[PDB]
UniProtKB/Swiss-Prot annotation, chains A, B:
It is found in: Plastid, Chloroplast thylakoid membrane. This is ATP synthase subunit beta, chloroplastic. F-type ATPases have 2 components, CF(1) - the catalytic core - and CF(0) - the membrane proton channel. CF(1) has five subunits: alpha(3), beta(3), gamma(1), delta(1), epsilon(1). CF(0) has four main subunits: a(1), b(1), b'(1) and c(9-12). Belongs to the ATPase alpha/beta chains family. It comes from the Eukaryota. It comes from Spinacia oleracea. Produces ATP from ADP in the presence of a proton gradient across the membrane. The catalytic sites are hosted primarily by the beta subunits.
Swiss-Prot record, chain C:
Produces ATP from ADP in the presence of a proton gradient across the membrane. SUPFAM superfamilies: Epsilon subunit of F1F0-ATP synthase N-terminal domain. It comes from the Eukaryota. One of its GO terms (molecular function) is proton-transporting ATP synthase activity, rotational mechanism. HAMAP family: ATP_synth_epsil_bac (MF_00530). The keyword Metal-binding does not apply. This is ATP synthase epsilon chain, chloroplastic. One of its GO terms (biological process) is proton motive force-driven ATP synthesis. It comes from Spinacia oleracea (Spinach). It is a peripheral membrane protein. F-type ATPases have 2 components, CF(1) - the catalytic core - and CF(0) - the membrane proton channel. CF(1) has five subunits: alpha(3), beta(3), gamma(1), delta(1), epsilon(1). CF(0) has three main subunits: a, b and c.
UniProtKB/Swiss-Prot annotation, chain E:
Belongs to the ATPase alpha/beta chains family. This is ATP synthase subunit alpha, chloroplastic. The record marks 145 as: Required for activity. Produces ATP from ADP in the presence of a proton gradient across the membrane. The alpha chain is a regulatory subunit. The chain holds residues 219 to 435 of 507 of the full protein. F-type ATPases have 2 components, CF(1) - the catalytic core - and CF(0) - the membrane proton channel. CF(1) has five subunits: alpha(3), beta(3), gamma(1), delta(1), epsilon(1). CF(0) has four main subunits: a, b, b' and c.
Curated annotation (Swiss-Prot), chain F:
This is ATP synthase subunit alpha, chloroplastic. It comes from the Eukaryota. Produces ATP from ADP in the presence of a proton gradient across the membrane. The alpha chain is a regulatory subunit. Belongs to the ATPase alpha/beta chains family. F-type ATPases have 2 components, CF(1) - the catalytic core - and CF(0) - the membrane proton channel. CF(1) has five subunits: alpha(3), beta(3), gamma(1), delta(1), epsilon(1). CF(0) has four main subunits: a, b, b' and c. It comes from Spinacia oleracea (Spinach). It is found in: Plastid, Chloroplast thylakoid membrane. The chain holds residues 219 to 290 of 507 of the full protein.
Amino acid sequence: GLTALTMAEYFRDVNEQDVLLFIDNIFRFVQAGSEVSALLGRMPSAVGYQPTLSTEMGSLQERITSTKEGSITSIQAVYVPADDLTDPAPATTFAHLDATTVLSRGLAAKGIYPAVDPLDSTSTMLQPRIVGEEHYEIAQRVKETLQRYKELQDIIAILGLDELSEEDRLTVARARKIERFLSQPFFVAEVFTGSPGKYVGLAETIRGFQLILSGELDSLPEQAFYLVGNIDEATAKAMNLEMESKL
Amino acid sequence: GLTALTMAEYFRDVNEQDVLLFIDNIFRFVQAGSEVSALLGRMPSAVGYQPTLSTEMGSLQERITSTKEGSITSIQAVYVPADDLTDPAPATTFAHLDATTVLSRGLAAKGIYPAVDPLDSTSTMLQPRIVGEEHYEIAQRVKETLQRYKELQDIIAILGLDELSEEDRLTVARARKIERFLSQPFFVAEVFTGSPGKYVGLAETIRGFQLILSGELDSLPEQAFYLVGNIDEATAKAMNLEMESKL
Amino acid sequence: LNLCVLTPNRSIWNSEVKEIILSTNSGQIGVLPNHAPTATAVDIGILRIRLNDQWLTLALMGGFARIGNNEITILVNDAERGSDIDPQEAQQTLEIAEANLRKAEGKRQKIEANLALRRARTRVEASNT
Amino acid sequence: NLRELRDRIGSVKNTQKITEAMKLVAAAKVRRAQEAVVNGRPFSETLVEVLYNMNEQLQTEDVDVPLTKIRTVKKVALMVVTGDRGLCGGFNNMLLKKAESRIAELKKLGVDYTIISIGKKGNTYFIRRPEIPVDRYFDGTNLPTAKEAQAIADDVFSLFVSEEVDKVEMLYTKFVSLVKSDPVIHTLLPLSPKGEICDINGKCVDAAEDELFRLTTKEGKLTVERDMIKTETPAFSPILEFEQDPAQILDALLPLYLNSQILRALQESLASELAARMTAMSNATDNANELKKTLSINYNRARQAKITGEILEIVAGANAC
Amino acid sequence: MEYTIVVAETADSPATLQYLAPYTGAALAEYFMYRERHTLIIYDDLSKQAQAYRQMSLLLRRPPGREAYPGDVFYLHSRLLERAAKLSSLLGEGSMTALPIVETQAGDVSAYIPTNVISITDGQIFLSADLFNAGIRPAINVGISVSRVGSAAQIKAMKKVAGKLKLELAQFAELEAFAQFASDLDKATQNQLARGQRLRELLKQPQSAPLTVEEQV
Amino acid sequence: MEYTIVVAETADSPATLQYLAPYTGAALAEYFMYRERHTLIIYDDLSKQAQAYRQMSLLLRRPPGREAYPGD
Amino acid sequence: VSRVGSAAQIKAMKKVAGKLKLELAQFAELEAFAQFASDLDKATQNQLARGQRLRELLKQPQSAPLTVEEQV
């Protein structure tokens, strides 16, 4: 990792370019010297942890800095250890990363690929100051519905979708939908997926989520929202599945 | 606590007095001795305790004693460590303890000074052998009044007390009065309030709990029974309020 | 007189009044201060209250009334406030009812539609009133 | 992992709060329903007074009312007042299984089982028992009004006004307890010549002194007493005169009385659904706090387990540093 | 106390004194026991003793096991508990009726102390803490309780007096399993339910009231 | 920042500096507060310092306590 | 939860704030009623509305601080 950092300084310090730094496996990068501390006889820290691994990842992240010379944009990636968030790796990593993404093994359990941890991936640049109160307001409504959806989903699995009120069930529709329309295809994914990937531009899905929380394609299905590119393409998939339901 | 016990062990023998022993917090003391095991390099026990934290806890606990000259009577404070009844720390404390007692948030909310937990104390010395079936029977009926009252408090909140039993209307008004007469002028309250602090006799409580538990004093308002530990004081202020409405 | 109008779900016009009048089987009678002890059924047709200032319709779709000693016990089967019904709305429902009366054949359905039209002309009537 | 255990513990807590909420909520629903069924006691009361009045004055061997015309045993219809929201206890399924027993009863008498239906769950149970004559399915009538009563009343009156349905019967769990309600079929059609309505079991419920659900707490559990106060059994006056007819007024009051019993029956089924839902949610809250204690027990057990793993990590250091 | 011997270790003992006074009681038991008498031991409690031996080998830094007990505590318990027998008539038929208190830490049956404690004990007598909260000391949760010899020493008096009671308690639990449904308990349901509710009243005693085996049967 | 001074530990801080810089800010508060002034401090998460002192005592080869934080 | 309390509050604040506490805990228990609050009583749905507006009276973004008086 330090060797990567040295090349990073050669391109972002020395060649001073807006650097692109894919970096993984950072949890294995922990795990090695984590394993080696007892091999060093450095004392047992936490569940696999080396002791000053805090400072080690601190030098990692602090070395991963956009200098005034170049912008060291840095794709870092650690295995969230067995989806334990308090596990000392991601625990240490939480202050380290600027924009961070847990994925959701619930959304991977929902089958999404991208399975974004919908409540649980945040950014420094997530702000109405930064993203715009268009974007921040939209996500405010969006995550609001998503969170109360996860909330009321407990009373769902206890109490049935019959127990739902009006706006709750509309939100539930919005939940399964905006889940599905939040899932996009990668052209990378096309062997494990088999779908054509759409490099989905941002304001397209800003429009789509504005429409989804607007309940425009509430007519459409979440099947018709499942792993698609545009809200227009979503309405198109609705047209396709509707004519298939004719067949 | 050892310094406390020796300074008290003077007056438990030298004064031979009824040694009151307020000690807060005992769980903090446990954590301190746990830290002493840590700084000892002692292999200390389960969830954070010293190994002989049981032994030291006994050693502290044992000296609280009714000796033949003076009686070291202790009230101490267990911080509920993560509210774990499975905490061996809370286990050790409760083993040393004699009377588990909560103090009521909800009756300071109901305004009662002293805000003693009407349901959430416990008295190990409350055998009718030990406590006296006068006290034990009387307080068992008192607990039943409290139990039914708070237990169908929500039922009457749905229903009206009219829809409740007249028994319950006797019970709910009776126990509202029981909580009201349970609100007692504390001696230390005389500073902050100005009411003279009634050091309530045990038999006064016995007769008062009798009277309200009888419903012999059912003409007394809980308004009149409030802030009045003493039984004759409650009937007397019922007369005082009857005259003040009469004057 | 003490009108105790009473639907089979609500005591409708429990106001005592100056005057009421009723669709008799003679066609209409009127109540009368200290009227007879008498009783009367009313068809699907608007009862009326000419109470102290106002003469207006009580749209009942059936019922009876124990006219005691200036003591009306007027229990209807279904007594709307004919003031409350929108004239266009109940006239439209009356139109649909006359049309479905032209539609429904068969003795149960024909009588259901004709009595529906009866209560519907009653509905439109105090709705016209 | 420990946090998932703590998580589902909190989930159980959320559902437990919700469970107590559902029990008390449908208790409030049933409380307004108790208010509701009592809110018509004057109507049926003075009705039954006039009923025994003109039944005394009726006194005839020749006059008739069309509902009072018991017709030929060709087709009995089955009236099913029901509940609406699912899992409201199983008053839905108990009354529907008793309704299936009634389908068997009218298949045993050969009386061509027409089925009047109320309630959207009753509508769905009729819609899922497709081998019957569904007569006129009435919707889930949330706090049913005299309007829907008038409508399905008119359905009853039209069809049983024909011999087409002769001698129909009305299934409803009368709200006896907040816990017990097996279904009871009161004899709906042909209308009662005594006025005292019968069961389809055959039991002539009294014209004068009859049961009606009210609710009262004998001890801390609020309870349900199907109390019976008898109405005024005076006739109309000797000074009172029949201004139109004896016979036609009998024929008219039959629609009124049929409507009164029908509205009361729909109120009975709705209150039964409210109560059984409430009881199920209450028992669920009990089971909930139980499972909560079991879960938190294993949670603190796992807390000890995490502490033990920490102790293990401590122990390797004892040989290490 | 004429017929007894009070084995007294204060709570603030040496943890070894706690960790060995079991053996002291074992010896004093063996005296009257190898004096062929009936004898009876009452340990209260090995759980605190388990804490003690945990603390003892812990002070040794001998690496303890599951739930921080060292392992041989059960073996210590096997040092303890394996003494008790109605011995051979060849030995002299001396009875040593040991029965220990066993502290229910939060009702956790998988406390390693309790986990071992069952494994030695031929009988397991689990108390009723809810009925202790019902004050109903003598409070015994009789279903979770167990004993291998249920009637081999219960008299023909006792067995033919209380086998019906045993099944009466079992069926009392059965008609006590889920009596919150039927809403008019029939004399089958209610008479067994109040017969067994009467049994729930019936086993209850004021404490220290050893009733006669006569009065028992 | 007129009213605020700033002190900071790096993520790449030597954890001695982390391990005491809290007390350093506390003494800064002392130089304000023994001067009778109202003064406020904002201690960014001492859990980081807890991992630090964990790294310290483990670096000290010292006795580790409850979840590897030192008892000290 | 906090320890100091009204010694740290303005009496200006405290007069409103006690009612804020009472209504806040009231809505807090009544947070269960929400999905079934169609069948809510007049004071029940009304206290729900009061605690609802009070709940609205909470939120503030990143750097949406207010003075004492505006909050008053």
